[PDB]
UniProtKB/Swiss-Prot annotation, chain A:
Compartmental location: Cell inner membrane
Purpose of the protein: The MdtABC tripartite complex confers resistance against novobiocin and deoxycholate.
Complex and partners: Part of a tripartite efflux system composed of MdtA, MdtB and MdtC. MdtB forms a heteromultimer with MdtC.
Signal peptide segment: none
Organism: Escherichia coli (strain K12 / MC4100 / BW2952)
Whole sequence portion shown: 1 to 50 of 1040
Highest taxon listed in the record's lineage: Bacteria
Record's protein name: Multidrug resistance protein MdtB
Gene (name only): mdtB
Length: 50, 50
């Protein structure tokens, strides 16, 4: 998508301002996934470079 | 009054049922969170998914 005139003054992110609940729940899910990952993903001392 | 070197160990239904109990609560919580998120995406509202 090249430099087009803004679509009804929203740019390429126009639909994003039309989704309040969607955004709020998306970032709630992102925070929950990050918390359960930091409690679940595998933290090692060194990379697996053998 | 068995000798102190006598221990016990069990297998089968007890382990399966304990694993099921451990999995059920987290499964229900994650599922309910997922439905809340998708329904909020579909309706763009707070109390409609509830």
């Amino acid at each position: 998508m090249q430099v087009l005139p803004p679509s009804s003054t929203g740019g390429p992110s126009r639909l994003f301002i039309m989704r309040p609940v969607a955004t709020t729940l998306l970032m709630v899910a992102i925070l929950l996934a990050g918390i359960i990952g930091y409690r679940a993903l595998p933290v090692s001392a060194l990379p697996e470079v053998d | 009054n068995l000798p102190v070197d006598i221990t016990t160990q069990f297998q089968g239904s007890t382990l399966a049922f304990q694993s099921a109990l451990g999995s059920t609560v987290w499964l229900i919580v994650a599922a309910v969170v997922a439905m809340y998120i998708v329904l909020g995406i579909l309706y763009e509202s707070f109390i409609h998914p509830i």
